Amino acid sequence: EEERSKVDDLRGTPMSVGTLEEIIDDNHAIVSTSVGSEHYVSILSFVDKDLLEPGCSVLLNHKVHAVIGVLMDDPLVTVMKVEKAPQETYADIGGLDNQIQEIKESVELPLTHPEYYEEMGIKPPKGVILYGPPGTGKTLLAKAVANQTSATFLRVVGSELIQKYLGDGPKLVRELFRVAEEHAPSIVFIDEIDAIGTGEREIQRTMLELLNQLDGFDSRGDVKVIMATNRIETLDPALIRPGRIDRKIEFPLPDEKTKKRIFQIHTSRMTLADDVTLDDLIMAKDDLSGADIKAICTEAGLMALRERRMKVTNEDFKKSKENVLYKKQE
Amino acid sequence: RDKAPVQPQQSPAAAPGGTDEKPSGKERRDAGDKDKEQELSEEDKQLQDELYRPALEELRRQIRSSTTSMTSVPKPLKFLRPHYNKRFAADIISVLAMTMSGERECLKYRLVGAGEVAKEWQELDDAEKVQREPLLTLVKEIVPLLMEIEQVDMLEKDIDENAYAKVCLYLTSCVNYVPEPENSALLRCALGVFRKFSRFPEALRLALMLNDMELVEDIFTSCKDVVMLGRHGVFLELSEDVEEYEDLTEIMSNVQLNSNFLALARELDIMEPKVPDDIYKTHLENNRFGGSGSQVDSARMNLASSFVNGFVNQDKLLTDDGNKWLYKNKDHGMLSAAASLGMILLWDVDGGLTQIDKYLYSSEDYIKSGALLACGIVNSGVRNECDPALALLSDYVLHNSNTMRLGSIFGLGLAYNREDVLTLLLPVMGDSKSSMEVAGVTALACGMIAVGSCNGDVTSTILQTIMEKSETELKDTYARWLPLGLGLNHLGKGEAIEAILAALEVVSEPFRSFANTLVDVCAYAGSGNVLKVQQLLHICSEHFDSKEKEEDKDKKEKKDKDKKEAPADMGAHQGVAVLGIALIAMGEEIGAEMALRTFGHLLRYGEPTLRRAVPLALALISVSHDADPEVSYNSIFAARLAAMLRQLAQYHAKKGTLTLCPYHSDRQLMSQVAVAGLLTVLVSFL
């Protein structure tokens, strides 16, 4: 007890918060600060030195800077990926059965059903790269959700996490590569790829460095990376040959029949009236994804649920359809 | 409507005003009233009033049941003796008589210990058999034998709803919330109604719980009368325990009507369908015998290659990869590799003699001792392989029959239930050799012979091993593995006072108090006895750091069914022994992602015993995500036990006592490698 309450002199008044740079195998690490002060001191207790993941903020002192403790960082990583297993499988959507069996056969052959993968002796651990004209996570998450049935998943949506802060660099990509290293049986999903589309000179070098570390120059077959953008013309031609090496496919235009199937899937569990017609619903829409029709299915089920009824009448589903007609025109 | 015309009618206490006003209350009693029966302050004089007094009692119990009461509601009905699909009968009978007769049976069941409550219970039984809303009135009438005439009075045509629903949730809440004797009423009455009905395999589970000799007879003359066959012989032999197989083969050898139940009663017809069908439709890869048989070295990973080699019993290449592989191996590996031929020859009974005969009567005593171990493992019903070992038995210090006693007595206990194995085991335990595994495989042998016995015998067998247990207080490993067999004899029942008899003649210095707490472990297979759960939390903080491990390790056996309460804050503590208690208490279940998380946190540790004993349950609970923990151990290690045990985790990856005894005996790995010579002969694996 006294030995536990005797190191209080180091963590007392002379205490600071620094940024550690790296750990040296010679039991003396190098730290930094706003002016970059490098002090090497033999390690102390309360530190892990293994899960610390150097390159983050640690605790320093006004003394010789003996490391007395650490502080966890980035709660921002929590909003990166989902850890749940949704019930949406590859058999819940139709029409693109070949388009979904191309990626299912593409990334579900490694690490699962390995007699057609390890006996051949190819191992292209790169995965396909897709793009959805509707986007907004509906089609791209309806194709990536096939891998989410029984497996670990890794999700990355939007290039904002690189542009919402100072140019720290590819260190966050190194965090995704170390969590993918410690989580090898996973699927890397990059969504809303608009790095160059949205300083600007550093975005090109952290994007080309993203291509460098994404190529896997030192790592063996560890994880299948699946990228997903919105516009194929925003990506430079240099990000294609190193990144996309397995296969790519095209997605048809969802005008009437794909919106009819999306409407059927979004209206399969719900109960609708007999007078609810389909031609006006697949007619009034114009280049719409599934998030807004899911929004009017939610507010239509709640609005119809106001009368303590689960049946959605035709006039109430057109009254909710006015949100679709207005939102895309606004 | 308004109470203007009918309100001044209940105030007159005259007999005609009651005999005409009360029928109007029965007419308007279809929905009770227009309100919550606020007329209590006006009918409280009718309470004291009395021609149609049973109607006054009916309306009185109607209003008292309507607003609130705990004891005064069913009195007008036990005194009334009611004689005078609508909404009236549904309201006044269904819910009002549901809670009414429920609180009457509860108050009369807890207060006093005549027949009026039985007449009410049968009347409500019939009325709620007409109501046809199941499991509500049932789940209320559980606690009131009367349940026998209730089930045989109800189980006539509704079989799927009462059997599936009532037996499912009433059996779950009958092992969870109901004590033992009423569960025995479930077993006997379920033997009745299920004997008169179909679905024999659930009655066979009622034989897994009853362990009675009549159920198998009636289900074999009825299953024989009702015409696959080898399949129900397979799970027939799986569901049966050590007693009713021996008794089953002696009653079927007493009847000998067809000898097909004699053929199915042994291990031959449970293995002859499996092996060819497994070799045909499944094709295991050779990259794990060549790979996992190639990265081995240091004379220990090679032992892990003898165990992975023992996994085959399709491909028998690593088995028949020439010779000298056992000659290069040391004693700790001569016994294990000697038993590898027994692990790889679980089938091919006739071939076992011509495969093991080459190593029999050899020059090294351990080669032929482990060869007799193989002869004991390969067979369990042939009983024609243990003649030479059982013959001599005469060394009294050491001549090939203390090690041949290890392999032949252990493998014979695995293949054991006659007295004329214990009349010969009397000089075995009476020998008192310095070798631990002599009394080890002796107590485990007779213990596995005495599992599931007729409530447990306290004869000179366990009395002899207790007296000779307390003979000398040296090599306390004897005190660690003799309570193993003691508990194997105490196993099979919880209510017995035999554990308190051990608390009488056993209690001593904390060695035999640890014996007594092992008897406490195995003498509490499981029931509704939360008293030992709060007592578990009370004695959980004992200074002795081993009775915590075993007595707290009993968690996986006590609450083995209700797995929602098994996860607790044992990992949040600071004692490494508790981390072992949870780590072993994970189990060998289907291995949900929560368990894989508990191994994702328990895996990272610094002690070689916990990091050594994590992959056993980690890969036992998961037999996609199978290769990730192996890569994790490759990243942690790259000691010897971690590499041999991670290759043994490559072995593991790719309510009977036979699946409970081996690992509970295996909970002694924190010692010399002598225990690891008994590690290679586990039988709990599938």
Task: Provide DSSP, A60-124.
Answer: E-SSS-----B----GGGGGT------S--TTS--S-HHHHHHHHHHHSSSSSSGGGTTTTT---
- Nearest alpha-carbon partner for B573 in B556, B552, B554, B559: B552
Question: What's the gap in Å between the CA of B626 and the closest CA on chain A?
Answer: 10
CA angle centred on A221, ends A217 and A222, rounded to 5°: 100
Q: Which residues of A touch B631 (CB under 8 A)?
A: 184
- Nearest alpha-carbon partner for B448 in B485, B402, B490: B485
Q: Could you tell me if B152 lies within 8 Å of chain A, comparing CB atoms?
A: no
Residues 6 or more apart whose CB falls under 8 angstroms from that of B57 comprise B76, B77, B79, B80
Question: Is residue B510 within 8 Å of B473, Cβ to Cβ?
Answer: no
Question: What's the gap in Å between the CA of B638 and the closest CA on chain A?
Answer: 14
CA distance B214 to B244: 10
A185–B624 C-beta distance less than 8 A: yes
What are B146-151's contacts with CB under 8 Å, separation 24+? B146/B118, B146/B121, B147/B182, B147/B185, B147/B189, B148/B185, B148/B188, B148/B189, B148/B192, B150/B121, B150/B125, B151/B189, B151/B190, B151/B192, B151/B193
Q: Could you tell me if A49 lies within 8 Å of chain B, comparing CB atoms?
A: no
CA A109 to chain centre: 22
Q: Give, in order, the Cα–Cα distances in Å from B108 to each of A118, B77, B96, B149, B488.
A: 72, 14, 18, 19, 42
What does DSSP assign to residue B7? Answer: G
What does DSSP assign to residue B245? Answer: H
A112–B631 C-beta distance less than 8 A: no
Question: Is residue B136 within 8 Å of B98, Cβ to Cβ?
Answer: yes
CA distance B102 to B107: 9
A135 carries a ligand binding annotation: yes
For residue A180, give the chain B residue with the closest CA.
Answer: B628
CA distance B581 to B602: 11
R_g of chain A, CA atoms, integer Å:
26
Q: Let me know if A310 is exposed, middle or buried by CB neighbors in 10 A (0-12, 13-18, 19+).
A: exposed
Question: What's the gap in Å between the CA of A22 and the closest CA on chain B?
Answer: 20
CA distance B287 to B280: 19
Q: Quick one: angle between helices B610-620 and B640-653, nearest 10?
A: 0
Residues 6 or more apart whose CB falls under 8 angstroms from that of A31 comprise A18, A19, A20, A21, A37, A38, A39, A58, A60, A65, A67
Residues 6 or more apart whose CB falls under 8 angstroms from that of B680 comprise B303, B306, B307, B310, B335, B336, B339, B340, B343
Q: Could you tell me if A184 lies within 8 Å of chain B, comparing CB atoms?
A: yes
Q: Which residues of B touch A151 (CB under 8 A)?
A: 624
CA distance B227 to B240: 21
For residue B592, give the chain A residue with the closest CA.
Answer: A150
A184–B628 C-beta distance less than 8 A: yes
Q: Tell me the pairing of strands A16-22 and A30-32.
A: antiparallel
As a whole number of Å, the end-to-end CA separation of chain A is 67
Question: Is residue B307 within 8 Å of B340, Cβ to Cβ?
Answer: yes
Question: Is residue B603 within 8 Å of B629, Cβ to Cβ?
Answer: yes
Amino acid code (one letter) for A312: V
Looking at B313-433, which runs of residues are DSSP E strands? none
A184–B624 C-beta distance less than 8 A: no
A216 carries a ligand binding annotation: no
Residue A312, SS3 per DSSP: strand
Q: Which residues of B touch A4 (CB under 8 A)?
A: none
> Which of B624, B627, B631 is opposite residue A151, by nearest beta carbon?
B624
Question: What's the gap in Å between the CA of A286 and the closest CA on chain B?
Answer: 42
User: What residue has token string 């969504």?
Assistant: A191
CA distance A152 to A111: 12
Q: Which residues of B touch A184 (CB under 8 A)?
A: 628, 631
A121 carries a ligand binding annotation: no
Q: Quick one: angle between helices B301-310 and B331-343, nearest 10?
A: 10
- Nearest alpha-carbon partner for B82 in B107, B119, B114: B119
CA distance B162 to B372: 52
A12 carries a ligand binding annotation: no
A114 carries a ligand binding annotation: no
For residue A108, give the chain B residue with the closest CA.
Answer: B624
For the record, the structure tokens of A218 come out as: 């030192």
For residue B636, give the chain A residue with the closest CA.
Answer: A50
Question: What's the gap in Å between the CA of B383 and the closest CA on chain A?
Answer: 43
For the record, the structure tokens of A114 come out as: 């390995």
- Inter-chain contacts counted by CB atoms under 8 A, chains A and B: 12
Question: Helices marked H in chain A — which ranges?
Answer: 97-107, 138-144, 160-163, 171-181, 200-214, 257-266, 281-284, 290-305, 314-327
A136 carries a ligand binding annotation: yes
CA distance B168 to B186: 12
Buried b (16+ CB within 10 A) or exposed e, A86-112: eeeebeebeebeebbebbeebbbbbbe
Question: What's the gap in Å between the CA of A80 and the closest CA on chain B?
Answer: 20
| Partner B, chain A 148-167, Cβ-Cβ below 8 Å | 150-152
Question: Is residue A177 within 8 Å of A186, Cβ to Cβ?
Answer: no
Experimental determination approach used: cryo-EM
| Partner A, chain B 373-412, Cβ-Cβ below 8 Å | none
CA distance A195 to B610: 47
For the record, the structure tokens of B594 come out as: 């929560």
Question: Helices marked H in B28-52 — which ranges?
Answer: 40-43
Q: Could you tell me if B283 lies within 8 Å of chain A, comparing CB atoms?
A: no
Question: Is residue B528 within 8 Å of B176, Cβ to Cβ?
Answer: yes
Torsion of CA B491, B495, B499, B503, to 10 degrees: 170
- The H-or-E segment that residue A32 falls in is strand A30-32
Q: Could you tell me if A84 lies within 8 Å of chain B, comparing CB atoms?
A: no
Q: Within 10 Å of residue B420's Cβ, how many Cβ atoms?
A: 8
Buried b (16+ CB within 10 A) or exposed e, A48-70: eeeeeeebbbbbbbeeebebbeb
CA distance A276 to A316: 10
Question: Is residue A274 within 8 Å of A302, Cβ to Cβ?
Answer: no
B624–A111 C-beta distance less than 8 A: yes
How many CA atoms lie within 13 Å of A55's alpha carbon, on the beta-carbon side? 10
Question: What's the gap in Å between the CA of A48 and the closest CA on chain B?
Answer: 12
Amino acid code (one letter) for A266: H
Q: Which residues of B touch A150 (CB under 8 A)?
A: 624
Question: Is residue A246 within 8 Å of A227, Cβ to Cβ?
Answer: no
| Partner A, chain B 591-630, Cβ-Cβ below 8 Å | 624-625, 627-628
CA distance B74 to B58: 10
- The H-or-E segment that residue B642 falls in is helix B640-653
